[PDB]
Structure formats: C-alpha cells, structure tokens
Amino acid sequence: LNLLVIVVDANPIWWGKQALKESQFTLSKCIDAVMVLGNSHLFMNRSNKLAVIASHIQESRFLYPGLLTSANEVIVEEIKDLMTHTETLLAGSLAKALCYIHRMNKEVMKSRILVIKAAEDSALQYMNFMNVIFAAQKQNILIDACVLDSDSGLLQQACDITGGLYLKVPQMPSLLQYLLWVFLPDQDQRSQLILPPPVHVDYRAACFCHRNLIEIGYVCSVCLSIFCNFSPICTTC
Amino acid sequence: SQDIINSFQSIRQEMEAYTPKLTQVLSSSAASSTITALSPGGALMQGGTQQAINQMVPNDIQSELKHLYVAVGELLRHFWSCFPVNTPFLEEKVVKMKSNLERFQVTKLCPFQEKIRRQYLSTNLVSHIEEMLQTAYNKLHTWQSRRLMKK
Amino acid sequence: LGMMRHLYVVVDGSRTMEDQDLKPNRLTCTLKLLEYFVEEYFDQNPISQIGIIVTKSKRAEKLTELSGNPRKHITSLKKAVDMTCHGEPSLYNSLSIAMQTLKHMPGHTSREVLIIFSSLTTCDPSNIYDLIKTLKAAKIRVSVIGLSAEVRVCTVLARETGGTYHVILDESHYKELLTHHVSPPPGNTEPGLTLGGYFCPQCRAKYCELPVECKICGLTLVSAPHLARSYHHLFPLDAFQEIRFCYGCQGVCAVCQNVFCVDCDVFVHDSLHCCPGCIH
Numbered sequence A: 001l002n003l004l005v006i007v008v009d010a011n012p013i014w015w016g017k018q019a020l021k022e023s024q025f026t027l028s029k030c031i032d033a034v035m036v037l038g039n040s041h042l043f044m045n046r047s048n049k050l051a052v053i054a055s056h057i058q059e060s061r062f063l064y065p066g067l068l069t070s071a072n073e074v075i076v077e078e079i080k081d082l083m084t085h086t087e088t089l090l091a092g093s094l095a096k097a098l099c100y101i102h103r104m105n106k107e108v109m110k111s112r113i114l115v116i117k118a119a120e121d122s123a124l125q126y127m128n129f130m131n132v133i134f135a136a137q138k139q140n141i142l143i144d145a146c147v148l149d150s151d152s153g154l155l156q157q158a159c160d161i162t163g164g165l166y167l168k169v170p171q172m173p174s175l176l177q178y179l180l181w182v183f184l185p186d187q188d189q190r191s192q193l194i195l196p197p198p199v200h201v202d203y204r205a206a207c208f209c210h211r212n213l214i215e216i217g218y219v220c221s222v223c224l225s226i227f228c229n230f231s232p233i234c235t236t237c
Numbered sequence B: 001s002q003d004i005i006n007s008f009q010s011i012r013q014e015m016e017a018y019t020p021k022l023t024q025v026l027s028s029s030a031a032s033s034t035i036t037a038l039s040p041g042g043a044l045m046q047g048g049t050q051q052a053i054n055q056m057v058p059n060d061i062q063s064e065l066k067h068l069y070v071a072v073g074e075l076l077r078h079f080w081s082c083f084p085v086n087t088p089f090l091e092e093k094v095v096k097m098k099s100n101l102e103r104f105q106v107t108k109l110c111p112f113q114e115k116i117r118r119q120y121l122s123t124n125l126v127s128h129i130e131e132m133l134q135t136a137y138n139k140l141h142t143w144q145s146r147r148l149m150k151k
Numbered sequence C: 001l002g003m004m005r006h007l008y009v010v011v012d013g014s015r016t017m018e019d020q021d022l023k024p025n026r027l028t029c030t031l032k033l034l035e036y037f038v039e040e041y042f043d044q045n046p047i048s049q050i051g052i053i054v055t056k057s058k059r060a061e062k063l064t065e066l067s068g069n070p071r072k073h074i075t076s077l078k079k080a081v082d083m084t085c086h087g088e089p090s091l092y093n094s095l096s097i098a099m100q101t102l103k104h105m106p107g108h109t110s111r112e113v114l115i116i117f118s119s120l121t122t123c124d125p126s127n128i129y130d131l132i133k134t135l136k137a138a139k140i141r142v143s144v145i146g147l148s149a150e151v152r153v154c155t156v157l158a159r160e161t162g163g164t165y166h167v168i169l170d171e172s173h174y175k176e177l178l179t180h181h182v183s184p185p186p187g188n189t190e191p192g193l194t195l196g197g198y199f200c201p202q203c204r205a206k207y208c209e210l211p212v213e214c215k216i217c218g219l220t221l222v223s224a225p226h227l228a229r230s231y232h233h234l235f236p237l238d239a240f241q242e243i244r245f246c247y248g249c250q251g252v253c254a255v256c257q258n259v260f261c262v263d264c265d266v267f268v269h270d271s272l273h274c275c276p277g278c279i280h
C-alpha cells in the first residue's frame, strides 16, 4: 500500500549554475530534502514502499532499489556515482516510473508520483510526455509536482489530468516544509485537509514541424496534427 | 558554449562532500514562516473570500451586468464577422468603416455607464468587460497597419 | 483514421411514443439511451458536432442547432422528457431541415443523419422519392433505427443514400445499435486553444468549462490534451522479439537494443504506447 515514486530533476547544468550563483541552495541541500521525505514516507505506515529516480542528461538511474540506514546510504552513493543535450529529459523518467509501479502492482495498492522539477521545460518531448500522462490516468496514478523557479507548462497538465497537486515554492531552503505539508498525505487523507488550489493551467500544443507552443493554429481533420500558420495541405499523409 | 563546460565541472566536485542531515536540512526560522504561508490568511486570498462582492447585493448590478453582456456581446458579433471575411471589397471596407465609429461609440457609452454605476461604491470589477472592447480596439489598429502593408 | 462527422439525430415524437415494450414510456427510453449516445460520441470523435431534431404533428422543429457542445445537448434532452407527443411525424420535413443546413458543410467531412423512428406512418405534404435523389447528390448518409416493424420507405432511404436500417429486438439491442454509430467511417480547420483556465484567445470571451466554439467571433475552442489521445495510431510502435535484469522495471526492443521483460512487454505496447528506451 501507498507506493510513492519520487522523480528528482538531477540536471547537472542547472544545478551547477546555482552552485556558482551562491543562492545558498545546492543539490546536496535538495537530495537530502528528498531523503527526509523518503524516510518520512516509510514511517506513516508499516507496509509502505519507496522508489527514487534521478533525471540526468541522456540517463535516468533508479536510486533506492539497487532500516533507513541502508535506505539512505544507497541514495547517497548513487548521486556520488551518477553526477560524476543541454536540456534535461523528464518523460524518460516518468516512463520508468509507470513501469516500476505496474510491476509492483502485479505482486499484490494505490500509487503516486512526485516530481521535483528544477530546470525549464523541454517542448521537444511533448509527443512522448503526453503519452505517459494518459497511461498514468488509466491506473489512477497521481502525478504530484513541485517546481522551484519557473512554471513548467507541461507539468501543470500532468497534475490536472491525473488529479494531483501543483505547487510552486517561493523559497528554496524551505523546500522540506512544503514537501511535508502537501505531498506527505496520501490520496485518501488528501480529502480531509486544506491544500492550495491550482491557480493556472498552461494548455497549448506543439506544431508537428517546429514544436513551438501555439495558442491559435490549424488542425487537420483526419490526422488531428495541429500546425502553425501555414495550412497548405496535410503534411503527414 | 563557455558556461556549460564549467557548470558541469562545478557540479562534479560538489558531489564528494555530502549528506548532512541534522540541522542542514531546515531551519527553525524559515519553517515557522512557512506556516504563515499556507495558513488561510497567508497566500490564500482566494480562500479568505469565495464570492465576488459585486458592489451591492448581486441582484440589481447583475441585472445591469447582464445588460452589459448583451450591449457589448451582440455588437461584437457584428464586428468580428466582417473582420473574419477579408473580402478586399468596398462593401466590406465601408462596413468596416461603419463599424469603426460605432465601436468607438460603444466605448463612451460603456465608460460613462461604468462611471455612473461604479461611483456609488466603486467596489466591483468592471474592467473584465473592458479588454473585450480593447480587443476590438487594437484589432482595428493592426488591420490598418496590415492594409498599409498590403497596399 | 476516421474523419469529421456532422451527425443529426432525428427523434420521433408521435402518438406511438407512449407505448410499452420498453421502459414504461417509449420516448423516455429513447431519450435515456440518447444521452448516453452523445457522451460516447464526443469521446471517440474530438472535433465533431451533433444536432437533434424532433418531429410532431406533421412538422419538424430543430431542438438544438448543430454545435459541438457535449453539455448543451444533454441538458436539452433532459428538458424534453415531458413532451406531449401528439400527432403523426413527418420524414420529408425532417430531412429538409437536416438538409438546408447540412448542405453547407465543407466537402472533406462525413455528413450523416440518424433517424430514430417509432411510428409507422410519415404523413408529409410532398413526395419522398425526390429527396432520396437529392440526398444522394449532397452525399448525405442517412441511417434509420426503427421500432417494432419494417417500413418500406425506411429501407429505400437507407440503402440508396448509403446508411443502414435495423429494427429493435429489445432495450439491450437498442443500446448495441447506437454503439455502432459512435465509430467514424474510415482540409485544415482553424481552432484556438484555451490557455488560462478556460478563456478565448481570439476575443477574450470568457465562458464556462466547455470545448464549444466561440459564440462571438465564431472560432472553435478545443482542448489540446483531448486531441493528444488520438495520436500513437499514426507512427505507431512496433512489436518486439524475445528469446533477469530489465530496463523498464529493473528486475527485446530491436530499435535501441534495450532488454525488457514479460510484464513490461505487455505494458509498453498496450498502455504506454511509447518505448521507454527510445525517448532517451
């Protein structure tokens, strides 16, 4: 019961930018906030599970499945091995997240995925990122998300299709207090608490040639491919 | 491509000194101020007031707000229809000229109406309608700039 | 795959709509399965439309204009549950209303008319057999779902224009016949997407949480996640070949050479619809 997969944004280009920005919030002061929420999920019930995924560039390693002193010393040594194409990939990590939930749901459970996104969104994976949301919506898997600086437009649609929460933190070093407040309770205890409501949804699409975010465009009538301001003929078939 | 090769360098050396847990994860000051953030009196302005005040009890103003819907709505459906058909004919050009003055006449007949109704308390929001006439305003500016580019 | 459809649904309002052998009112069993039909139609068809016409006392009246609102049809069928249903219907008048405003759709669609007909008699002031020559010219595909019998003019109307004609066994057969019409048979429109909760991008006309077109500027406002579900049929994913440690679940694709398992090979192809190794 209550399996919680955390997908951390381990983008080594954005985290190195803040490591020299002297903003007093590095990666090592953020993975330990995942480790405390990882440890605090293993206390609210006896039979609770955990899985942490790290989103590198061109790689996405599982962290925790390779008492809590053997559950935190693995995530410490794996960040020490993974952190030693200038945009991160997120849909490859949520694809492994839906694969791990589906296997652990075969050995029995309500599950949910918490994404801690840090860098800006990559619109080049919108055709794949939207597939893993409907694959998660058909199994009632919540996709919660907390963002650090910039509102990811793709990630707000993940929390409203599935039914999760979207929360923009205003402060970097108070990350753990938001994580323990709105993402620590499960789906059933969420109905009995007050959470901040979603404030905005970023509904756009992408062209099939430029993949730009369009608000007014042209769709085909048989292919349903949305296009930019040309509309000569159906390009696909 | 000069800052990518060093920020990737700076994050590799950072991941040797690692895992402080006791006091380096949170502070007592920042976590206490976060309680004020998620309280119903903090960054929850939608939580403190759920229903719009509408400058009075919403019976008489919402009658005029419904009349302000029909006064701008059924005039803009004549504006956007002739704007839709590009046509490049004199009949559509004269209709665009005829709708130009009326849309300008729709401004002063709604601004004075918002100067009469919202002077008793000035409590409700009336500018939500105003961008719909402002969208009718700048669409005449960009078409005249396009017709100057077309000719 | 399928194309756009502009489907009218013609509902009978005869004297014989108060008959048994259904739910105890024959009209309210038709309106019950039609409200299920409108919901299932807009989910397998994203950008289509539905009109609903009724016939009563030798006249046809358009109950709902042809618009793609999946809510405005259901709240109007719930209003017409207590219709009086006096007189005999007409089939020339109903296919004239459903032709004066279905002739002007563009030619890259599949215009259709579905007549749910309970009465046996179509008292109409003109000849029917020139409409069927006219409906065949306008490429309209008229299909009839009949009740309790088989009228001759409803087979000529179905097989000449191109539709089908079926007769009800019971209420379970009636729900099965309507589910054959939700599937589409095998040009570029201008929509505007609806960022900011639900606003309008062309003229800032705020309204409720609908995929309906703009009532002022006349632009269709669709939701881009709704169109996203109908992908993955075009450039679909291929199957794998098979002969410990996995790549998806961590405990064989021929594109990127990534080993899967049996519990992952059933999940990538069926529900995930995208290879988790190919996204890297």
Ligand SMILES: [Zn+2]
Binding pocket: A220, A221, A222, A223, A224, A234, A236, A237
């Ligand atoms: Zn096409």
Ligand SMILES: [Zn+2]
Binding pocket: A207, A208, A209, A210, A211, A212, A227, A228, A229
């Ligand atoms: Zn484009």
Ligand SMILES: [Zn+2]
Binding pocket: C200, C201, C202, C203, C204, C205, C214, C216, C217, C218, C219
């Ligand atoms: Zn509009």
Ligand SMILES: [Zn+2]
Binding pocket: C246, C247, C248, C249, C250, C251, C260, C261, C262, C263, C264, C265
């Ligand atoms: Zn596997």
Ligand SMILES: [Zn+2]
Binding pocket: C253, C254, C255, C256, C257, C258, C275, C276, C277, C278
């Ligand atoms: Zn592959």
